[PDB]
């Protein structure tokens, strides 16, 4: 009948974290139709605010004061995206009342900001010092290190870690600061599934996340669906949003009780995170988290400028080498020897564990003997001979049935002159042996029902599973270099 | 090694604006060794702070209070760069005290925040306004427009301008907001030497300048040379830095009394500026200038994103046309046929008033008849026969004796198959063009007791230059397209 079935092998990369319908109980949620009518609220509204915003009705100044209604009625008469907060005392004690809009729904988030003070809010001066410092760090390694230190100096979280994401969305704990009795996680690596593509999108779109108590009871917002759409409230930009039970379990295995993380975005991609953990409940006043959102935007712009400045230098140096190669082959008595010569040749341009030159049936292998792999890739490309350039980081290595076997799973190949079997190859061995230096963590636990994968060791062992057999991946600069060299060689083939 | 010192191209670039040895008098400067020993001071400290700083002493709590010494000593005991600021009262004045370190020297800068509203000067709520504004714009035209409006609304400067650099480092006022009775500078161009190379480099480093009164007298800092080095104090990052006397003369000839400007940096180049003028002295509290320093980076990142998205779209469409042309040519019996006819063909790739295809001694003309010009250019190109690409917008016209003259100013040509004199041409006729210079670009020289001063223009009257004998310039994208077509047709001739 149905003749189709959605992709459903995964368990919990698809659990939708932007529309959970549940709230962190250190605050309260109220949700409004675009006219202003109350549609749903978190049921702790009475416990914190002393009033019920009755669904199907409107707020009153005798509930929220005028201060909130200035904001909301400039909101309700506003257009496009909206976001604001206001300072007030509700009943006996102080609140931050925070609000935004998304997909025609207007949201009110009430966060407690009581038993803390302007003196404590001197954290605003610390955040502005962090913002002033980062703008002058000269590389991303020192930037991430110093920020990971000073974030902890400021906030007093038990741990802070800098994550950096690789081309495959795997992550590495590239820097750490910790309370010294706690185990270090420096140099851990984890698979891309550790941050599912929805959390990817939310950390790109929503610079700050705060988790006040991993042991929280989630406040059910009621009614559960917006009566106008008859669909879930999209909480993507809220702050009180329910954490996924999977990540609460993962943090409970780590023994974490509260979290804050600060996004770094580059090129519209999640380039990194700072992640802060504390082993007992912790809460940060909203005015400070606004300053960390500002910090996230500043840091993202700085990192993106540094990484673009690095890539431009890579492409510069490679171009200046390749033009010398072209010059030498044009001036010399032979192209083929000038390609294979160790002092300047194809083996110098691209990082490789070996290189092979092929032209007119002549072949040479540099740093090894690769005429087997060259033949085998040609026999693969003989199934698609219109392909000009081929590369892989995961070639099926020659088997142990013969000394023809060997580690060259990385191949990069140029057809520079199809009419005389002019080819160039570069090769790479398997990566993992070079990088195998993250120590496996060992924390003794009463492990949660999901089992040991929701732990740093589980994640590390599941990461090695992912990189087994892969070479060091061919960089976009490497591919650009091969692309350009092909066309430099064609000019010599043409004039020869 | 080199045994010679590089010579600068023009004395415009020689003035070392980073080492004036003086500050603007609306504040004071103290400079300290890495252990906090005083090295040099501005001459006005007692006139402003009430005490004399002596080199070789240390700043004492009786002089600056505990908040400053806490800030400074938390600086000195830090690692790497430092910058911080604190709000404090000294004598009767409220001060902003701004600290930074650069090239192993520590600086303390004092700004009086006298007679201003402590509430509305809150840094974070100022940053909120502009950063909420910038992120709502979909293109650089509306971005620079409404940002220039919000900048004027916030600061109350008499004029704000968006200034955009050209490929020759000239620049043009692309947006403005002004007091109603003032002249409008919108659309005028200004020659490249109005912002010298070293100024543009410094403004890539330091995003914000302010001049509180263009009429100021610099407060010298004594001693002028740092005893640790006997070199000048590099003031590149100081906020009180004495702006160049030449630029103060420039703004005096504009009739401006106070200035602020904000860098826009894209791709590691100074891409443009926001610049602000007031016809009376004006000073902006440091928290607001800090919020503009943040805005400078967020705006630069967003301008970079928008311009990358535009150029990438142009590249996409052009590459699709180039490959469609290659598909036609490779699938045609004569390349020289499929190149010519208006069903795509060469004339479709680049905006041109004429084109010609030449190969093997054949010629064809498109949108006209160009064998005369082509022959003349190729005979001229025998003077540089290794050259494979030639272009001009200013082909030197013949005398008026006949319209047989090869008057076509715009020529672009590529040698795609030298072995058969394979040449392609694109042409553009003259475009009569008009430039409103902001002041006539007279020679920037006056002779006096200093010798020849590089004096700015005598007035800023809009003076029109009428440009004739030029085509529309060949764009860098046009040249990139010609290059890629050259390589594609080199491949195709290599097979043919
Ligand atoms: C070496 C130690 C180590 C640690 C501590 C580690 C944890 C980790 N979880 C993160 C986030 C999330 N993960 C999941 C879901 C799942 N997490 C998985 O691993 C798989 C099984 C799974 C689903 C397929 C979700 C929904 C979120 C978003 C939660 C939210 O923000 O509401 C992040 C980034 C943010 C942060 O720092 O908390 C980190 C760093 N990963 C490691 O390797
Ligand atoms: C309406 C149009 C308009 C334009 C085009 C404009 C340009 C401009 N020049 C700037 C900087 C400098 N220019 C020069 C020197 C030269 N300038 C010239 O004209 C010739 C005579 C000359 C040398 C032979 C120097 C040394 C500096 C560094 C100053 C310092 O930082 O000490 C700045 C940034 C400063 C600011 O915010 O005001 C701007 C915004 N200002 C306008 O209002």
Numbering used by the authors:
A (entry chain B), B (entry chain A): 1 to 496
Share the article's original sentences:
Phytochromes are light-sensitive proteins that are found in plants, fungi, and bacteria. The chromophore can photoswitch between these states but also thermally converts in darkness. Most phytochromes dark-revert to the Pr state, although “bathy” bacterial phytochromes revert to Pfr.
In order to solve the structure of the PrPfr heterodimer state during dark reversion of PaBphP, we made use of its expected relative concentration as derived from spectroscopic observation, and cryo-trapped the protein on electron microscopy grids at 120 s, 300 and 960 s after photoexcitation with a laser diode at 780 nm. The newly observed structural state is a PrPfr heterodimer with one protomer in Pr and the other one in Pfr, as judged based on the secondary structure of the PHY-tongue, isomerization state, and location of the chromophore, and the rotamerization states of key residues lining the binding pocket. The observed PrPfr heterodimer structure is naturally asymmetric at the tongue and chromophore regions due to the different photochromic states. However, we also observe strong asymmetry beyond these regions at the dimer interface of the PAS/GAF domains. We conclude that the interface region at the PAS-GAF domains is intrinsically asymmetric in PrPr and PrPfr (but not in PfrPfr) and that the positioning of helix A plays a decisive role in breaking the symmetry. This leads to the surprising observation that only one of the protomers (protomer B) dark-reverts from the PrPr state to the hybrid PrPfr state. Turning to the MD simulations of the hybrid PrPfr state, we intriguingly find that the “H–H2O” conformation of H277 in protomer A increases in frequency compared to PrPr (“H-OD” ∼ 23%, “H–H2O” ∼ 18%).
